[PDB]
Amino acid sequence: TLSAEDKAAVERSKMIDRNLREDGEKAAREVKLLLLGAGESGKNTIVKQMKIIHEAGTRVKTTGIVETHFTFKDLHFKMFDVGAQRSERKKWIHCFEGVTAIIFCVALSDYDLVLAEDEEMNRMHASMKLFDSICNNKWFTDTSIILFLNKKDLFEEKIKKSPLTICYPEYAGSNTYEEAAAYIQCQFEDLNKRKDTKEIYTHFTCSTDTKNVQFVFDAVTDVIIKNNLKDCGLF
Amino acid sequence: YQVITSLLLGTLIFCAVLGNACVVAAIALERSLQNVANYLIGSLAVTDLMVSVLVLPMAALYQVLNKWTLGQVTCDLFIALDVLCCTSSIWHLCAIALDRYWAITDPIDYVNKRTPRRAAALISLTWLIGFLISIPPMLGWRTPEDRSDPDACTISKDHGYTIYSTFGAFYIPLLLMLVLYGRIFRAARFRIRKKNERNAEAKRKMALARERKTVKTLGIIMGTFILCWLPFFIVALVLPFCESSCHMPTLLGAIINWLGYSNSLLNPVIYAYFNKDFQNAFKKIIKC
Amino acid sequence: DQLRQEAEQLKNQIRDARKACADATLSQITNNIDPVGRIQMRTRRTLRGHLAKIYAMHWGTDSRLLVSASQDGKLIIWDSYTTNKVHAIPLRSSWVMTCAYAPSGNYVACGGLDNICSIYNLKTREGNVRVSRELAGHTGYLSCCRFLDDNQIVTSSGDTTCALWDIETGQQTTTFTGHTGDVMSLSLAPDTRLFVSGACDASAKLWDVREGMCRQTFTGHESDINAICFFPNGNAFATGSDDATCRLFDLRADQELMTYSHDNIICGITSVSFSKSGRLLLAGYDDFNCNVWDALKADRAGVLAGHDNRVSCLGVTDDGMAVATGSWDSFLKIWN
Amino acid sequence: SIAQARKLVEQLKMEANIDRIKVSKAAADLMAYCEAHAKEDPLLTPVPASENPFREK
Ligand SMILES: C/C=C\C/C=C\C/C=C/C/C=C/CCCC(=O)O[C@H](COC(=O)CCCCCCCCCCCCC)COP(=O)(O)O[C@H]1[C@H](O)[C@@H](O)[C@H](OP(=O)(O)O)[C@@H](O)[C@H]1O
Ligand SMILES: CC(C)CCC[C@@H](C)[C@H]1CC[C@H]2[C@@H]3CC=C4C[C@@H](O)CC[C@]4(C)[C@H]3CC[C@]12C
Numbered sequence: 025t026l027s028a029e030d031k032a033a034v035e036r037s038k039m040i041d042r043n044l045r046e047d048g049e050k051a052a053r054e055v056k057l058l059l060l061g062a063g064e065s066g067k068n069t070i071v072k073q074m075k076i077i078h079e080a081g082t083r084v085k086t087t088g089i090v091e092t093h094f095t096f097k098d099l100h101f102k103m104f105d106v107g108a109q110r111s112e113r114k115k116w117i118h119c120f121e122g123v124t125a126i127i128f129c130v131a132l133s134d135y136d137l138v139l140a141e142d143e144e145m146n147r148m149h150a151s152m153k154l155f156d157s158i159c160n161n162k163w164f165t166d167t168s169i170i171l172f173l174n175k176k177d178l179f180e181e182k183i184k185k186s187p188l189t190i191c192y193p194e195y196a197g198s199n200t201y202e203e204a205a206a207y208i209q210c211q212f213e214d215l216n217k218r219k220d221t222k223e224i225y226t227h228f229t230c231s232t233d234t235k236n237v238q239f240v241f242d243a244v245t246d247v248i249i250k251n252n253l254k255d256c257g258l259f
Numbered sequence: 260y261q262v263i264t265s266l267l268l269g270t271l272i273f274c275a276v277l278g279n280a281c282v283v284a285a286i287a288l289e290r291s292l293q294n295v296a297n298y299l300i301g302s303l304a305v306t307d308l309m310v311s312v313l314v315l316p317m318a319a320l321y322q323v324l325n326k327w328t329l330g331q332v333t334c335d336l337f338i339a340l341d342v343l344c345c346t347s348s349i350w351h352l353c354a355i356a357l358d359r360y361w362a363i364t365d366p367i368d369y370v371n372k373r374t375p376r377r378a379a380a381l382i383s384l385t386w387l388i389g390f391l392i393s394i395p396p397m398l399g400w401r402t403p404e405d406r407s408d409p410d411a412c413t414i415s416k417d418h419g420y421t422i423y424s425t426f427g428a429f430y431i432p433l434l435l436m437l438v439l440y441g442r443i444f445r446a447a448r449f450r451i452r453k454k455n456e457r458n459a460e461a462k463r464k465m466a467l468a469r470e471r472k473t474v475k476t477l478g479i480i481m482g483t484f485i486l487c488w489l490p491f492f493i494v495a496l497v498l499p500f501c502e503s504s505c506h507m508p509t510l511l512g513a514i515i516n517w518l519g520y521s522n523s524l525l526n527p528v529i530y531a532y533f534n535k536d537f538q539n540a541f542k543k544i545i546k547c
Numbered sequence: 548d549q550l551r552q553e554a555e556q557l558k559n560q561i562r563d564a565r566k567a568c569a570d571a572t573l574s575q576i577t578n579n580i581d582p583v584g585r586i587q588m589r590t591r592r593t594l595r596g597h598l599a600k601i602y603a604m605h606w607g608t609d610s611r612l613l614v615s616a617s618q619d620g621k622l623i624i625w626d627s628y629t630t631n632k633v634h635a636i637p638l639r640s641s642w643v644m645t646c647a648y649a650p651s652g653n654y655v656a657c658g659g660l661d662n663i664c665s666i667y668n669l670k671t672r673e674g675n676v677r678v679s680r681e682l683a684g685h686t687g688y689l690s691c692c693r694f695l696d697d698n699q700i701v702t703s704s705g706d707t708t709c710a711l712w713d714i715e716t717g718q719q720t721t722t723f724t725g726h727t728g729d730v731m732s733l734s735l736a737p738d739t740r741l742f743v744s745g746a747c748d749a750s751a752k753l754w755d756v757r758e759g760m761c762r763q764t765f766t767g768h769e770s771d772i773n774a775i776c777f778f779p780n781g782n783a784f785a786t787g788s789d790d791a792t793c794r795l796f797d798l799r800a801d802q803e804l805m806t807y808s809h810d811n812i813i814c815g816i817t818s819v820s821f822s823k824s825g826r827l828l829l830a831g832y833d834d835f836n837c838n839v840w841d842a843l844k845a846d847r848a849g850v851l852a853g854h855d856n857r858v859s860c861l862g863v864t865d866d867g868m869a870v871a872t873g874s875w876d877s878f879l880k881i882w883n
Numbered sequence: 884s885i886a887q888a889r890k891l892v893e894q895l896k897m898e899a900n901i902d903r904i905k906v907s908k909a910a911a912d913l914m915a916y917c918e919a920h921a922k923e924d925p926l927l928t929p930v931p932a933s934e935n936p937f938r939e940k
């Protein structure tokens with residue numbers, strides 16, 4: 025109790041506890057985003073689009089999870105890529121409960137193609153299966169989803185030849201970029217069963233300035249503001 | 260007669276001290292309820308508890324006996340403590356409205372620069388304003404009419420002091436709250452407003468439902484703050500300035516007084532007993 | 548191909564042999580045994596300091612020190628007698644799913660969604676802990692790890708494989724293949740000569756450290772196995788599963804002996820452990836509480852309620868004095 | 884997926900050719916161990932507070 029070693033131990037415990045509170049406050053000032061999507065769905069294009077001029081504010085390659093730090097308008101973002109984790113999803117998907125939002129990337133030009141696992145499985149039907157699975161987990165009831173529709177210009181070039189009816193048999197209408205993009209967007213947002221709790225923000229990836237990072241910013245601030253209105257009782 | 264009034268005012272004090280201790284206790288021992296917002300609500304409960312144990316019992320006695328029987332010195336203390344703890348209560352309602360405002364309208368500050376030191380500074384400023392309003396009458400700003408009648412524990416009712424302690428305690432607090440919650444209402448309404456047809460219809464119904472939730476909430480907060488303290492602070496500004504033929508019916512005096520003090524009973528109900536985070540933590544502690 | 552016919556008839560041979568060895572259930576033999584009696588354990592310590600979900604803990608062999616891991620990327624070493632934080636190691640990756648504490652008391656290990664096991668030299672010349680080694684080679688997340696000795700460690704991973712490493716060299720000496728699902732759990736034998744593993748294929752398998760071969764298989768559960776623990780004797784083990792039930796298997800009989808289940812439990816088991824004498828089986832659950840089972844009777848003897856969230860980790864002292872349970876609410880509670 | 888099936892069957896014949904014993908003998912061994920060490924475990928029988936380091940030093 026009053027021994028010198030006891031006092032030294034208590035002081036060390038106090039020093040450690042102060043550092044741990046300082047670390048917890050610093051860490052609380054970040055916005056954590058989970059990045060999902062199919063394998064060749066343009067995830068790397070998005071990752072690069074975020075880290076253009078502002079990044080990071082004998083090690084071994086991790087290969088499990090990829091970290092991406094970027095700041096935009098006085099807001100620091102953490103984005104986690106788990107595309108290289110080829111295992112059972114439900115074993116580790118609960119570790120990401122509490123993220124601000126989920127970024128899902130779909131390649132619009134994937135409808136003609138099929139997966140290499142089996143020919144009778146369209147790449148976009150697997151995309152909807154993944155979207156339905158992640159959107160309706162018990163852990164992600166209140167997590168909003170940012171949806172990116174990648175490769176618009178290759179999608180456009182294709183639909184002059186191949187119709188969208190090969191992906192959606194029940195579809196019937198003219199063939200042009202606007203009416204196909206709208207139909208696919210309405211198809212992916214119909215998979216939302218938690219309409220009252222969560223919202224889907226859809227965008228078409230452009231290659232102009234940082235309009236993609238502006239979209240993420242404007243969607244994350246909307247999420248935060250709506251959370252604070254619900255806490256206050258006004259939403 | 261006096262049996263009736265002593266038990267009606269007696270239950271009011273009991274329900275008040277019970278309601279406020281429960282809120283502080285929930286905060287004290289629940290780790291979930293340890294956020295900047297619930298610190299400011301918890302401090303209102305402390306202040307409102309301090310009113311219900313210190314002022315309200317000593318005031319109920321002056322009502323049922325119709326005389327002051329504690330001497331001139333105790334009464335100076337009663338008046339000072341009445342103008343200290345109750346002013347601090349009305350400025351706690353503005354600290355909460357400024358915190359809510361800075362969160363709806365400033366996400367960057369919310370994420371980056373918002374810490375419990377904010378709540379500590381706000382509570383300290385509230386109590387400082389309370390002291391700055393309640394101390395002047397002790398060191399000056401006092402009329403001999405207060406001490407003229409031993410069977411009376413009224414306030415200085417100096418004209419300049421009336422303006423000071425009536426504008427700095429209600430009328431300036433009121434303006435601030437009407438501006439902040441109007442801005443909050445406009446910001447809310449924006450965020451709300453901004454087969455496919457069924458989806459459209461569903462969204463239209465959800466928007467209207469959320470526009471009825473926000474209007475109901477704002478109407479409750481302000482229409483409980485107004486209907487508690489406004490009747491009192493109108494009379495307390497008029498009577499001293501308009502002396503001639505302005506007889507206050509004794510009955511009306513007491514109803515108005517104890518309608519004001521009922522704000523310390525209704526504040527826990529609206530700020531604590533409605534938000535689920537508290538309501539569910541009460542379930543938890545009740546079940547061992 | 549046509550090798551499935553021979554595989555099927557060998558399956559039928561094993562089944563028929565196991566049935567001939569059944570003559571009297573444990574429950575018919577432990578029938579004249581006096582019941583344990585209701586167990587009243589009351590939380591003695593509550594350790595605080597983690598800011599996120601705890602996932603793992605491991606007691607020290609000195610029965611006083613213990614290490615824990617949290618999603619906030621901190622590895623705290625506690626003094627359980629005085630409730631004192633002795634060390635606090637900042638991890639490179641905050642996605643940690645397991646930890647282990649060396650039997651000699653000089654090293655700790657970590658691992659998680661990063662497919663790497665990191666080893667820290669606690670006892671150094673400066674008193675500041677640094678990353679002694681990093682072990683790479685697994686293709687999936689590191690599920691479990693246990694120090695075989697001061698220079699060897701056994702790890703299991705979500706690539707359906709386990710591996711033994713040499714810390715000084717840094718490369719995996721042996722690889723244990725044969726599982727068809729994610730390997731979730733792992734338990735070293737008391738003599739550190741064998742070890743068992745539970746997987747997502749609803750089976751438990753036994754391995755030999757030297758030969759690197761599977762000796763036995765155990766199929767009693769119908770869903771994923773999340774925890775496994777050796778009996779103190781070393782001739783049996785217990786498995787925790789999502790079936791809301793835990794089972795006891797015996798090495799020499801090659802079959803399960805007991806099934807601990809109840810109608811009021813429909814969640815999954817996250818952790819299991821045995822008492823010093825093996826009479827008690829402590830199991831953590833998703834229902835926020837730990838239920839104490841009588842190993843020889845399959846009846847509840849007590850409940851360790853008191854955690855606000857899911858109980859994720861659990862451990863019994865080497866001398867058997869006290870039991871520690873961590874949870875998702877970021878509090879370790881020593882019960883004794 | 885053919886070499887897989889050959890490896891599978893080669894393991895199954897190693898796990899079939901092992902010495903098994905009667906379930907009664909194993910149960911007897913476990914119970915002998917349990918009441919063999921039944922005094923050494925403070926969790927089974929509460930320990931006096933004088934000898935308990937986690938209640939009073
Ligand atoms: C004519 C036209 C139109 C007008 C006519 C009719 C319609 C309106 C009438 C006027 C309204 C009267 C009161 C309505 C209250 C009401 O609806 O309450 C709801 C239901 O809760 C209960 O029922 C449970 C509440 C239990 C509270 C405790 C009870 C016991 C207290 C005893 C105290 C003394 C003894 C200790 C709960 O609240 P709510 O649904 O109104 O919604 C919000 C609430 O208003 C916000 O305050 C709250 O924010 P907070 O300030 O942090 O709490 C929000 O989170 C949210 O809960
Ligand atoms: C004798 C007098 C002074 C006191 C009587 C007891 C008090 C505590 C009673 C009388 C009227 C009551 C209120 C009547 C109606 C409601 C609306 C309900 O949705 C929440 C509780 C609330 C707000 C009650 C809270 C308790 C209350 C204020």
Ligand SMILES: CC(C)CCC[C@@H](C)[C@H]1CC[C@H]2[C@@H]3CC=C4C[C@@H](O)CC[C@]4(C)[C@H]3CC[C@]12C
Pocket residue numbers: 474475476477478479482483486487525
């Ligand atoms: C006097 C004390 C006890 C407070 C009791 C509440 C009293 C003042 C009543 C009378 C008038 C009422 C308001 C009348 C109109 C509306 C609009 C409605 O869409 C939501 C409720 C709301 C906003 C009511 C809230 C409660 C209210 C303010």
Ligand SMILES: CC(C)CCC[C@@H](C)[C@H]1CC[C@H]2[C@@H]3CC=C4C[C@@H](O)CC[C@]4(C)[C@H]3CC[C@]12C
Pocket residue numbers: 263264267268271322510513514515517518521524525
């Ligand atoms: C909490 C809310 C609902 C309570 C609203 C009603 C309040 C204002 C009522 C309930 C009991 C009332 C008191 C009952 C008895 C008397 C004695 C009388 O000679 C003067 C008025 C006086 C002192 C009343 C003042 C107003 C009073 C306090």
Ligand SMILES: CN1C[C@@H]2c3cc(Cl)ccc3Oc3ccccc3[C@@H]2C1
Pocket residue numbers: 341342343345346349414424425428429495516
């Ligand atoms: C019944 N009391 C009177 C007292 C008060 C009276 C006058 Cl004239 C001015 C300031 C006052 O301080 C405040 C301030 C706010 C609320 C109540 C009071 C209390 C309530």
